[PDB]
Symmetry: C2
Subunit: 124 residues, 2 copies
Amino acid sequence: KESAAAKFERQHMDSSTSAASSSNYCNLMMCCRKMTQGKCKPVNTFVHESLADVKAVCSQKKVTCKNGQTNCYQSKSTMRITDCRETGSSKYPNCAYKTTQVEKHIIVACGGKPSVPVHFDASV
Amino acid sequence: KESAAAKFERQHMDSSTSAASSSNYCNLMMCCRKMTQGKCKPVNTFVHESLADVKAVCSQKKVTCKNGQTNCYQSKSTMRITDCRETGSSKYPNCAYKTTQVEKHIIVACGGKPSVPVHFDASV
């Protein structure tokens, strides 16, 4: 069981750089964050902001998911992000990527599974 | 923080016993759990079950709250609980309580949380 929130974090969070280091970054991280196992993942975005700042998006502008869902939210401010695009010469097992550093509003799907007791009402 | 979820736990959770030791149990716990400060809390219920079993109730039978609210749920199983009722001789600063150990379905107000990112949708 990998949680969707850990999978998101693994696939999309990078608080260790403020910007994609060089032109190799996506080739490294897509390797490192395991998105090149079995296939090459064509596109992926890393966000160079705190996990707090990224989580806070779940309480910001509500907009629609691309697939038709509604649990998608948009960041008030822009964020430092890195778009990683699979190139033409890419062919599993040898996956290559283009690294692109931009500052754009992100849009994420915000889910959850935990409801907790906050008041004891009665017994029956 | 103290979180509402911590206030609940402090006021209502006791996984160290499965049953009230003696009849002083509430005088101990009500005092220890900080419920005799400033005033005496007339009634309180402790649950002698794991914090997991109590949490999972938030994803069980939804029933109506006592004040009219709807964020209340009822336990599939009965649970070992201890009720503490302020007694006749009770008077702040000296709060006395009556102890009653029963096994009943509990009902809690669940202040759910659904705030984590699970998929990156777009940038804009």
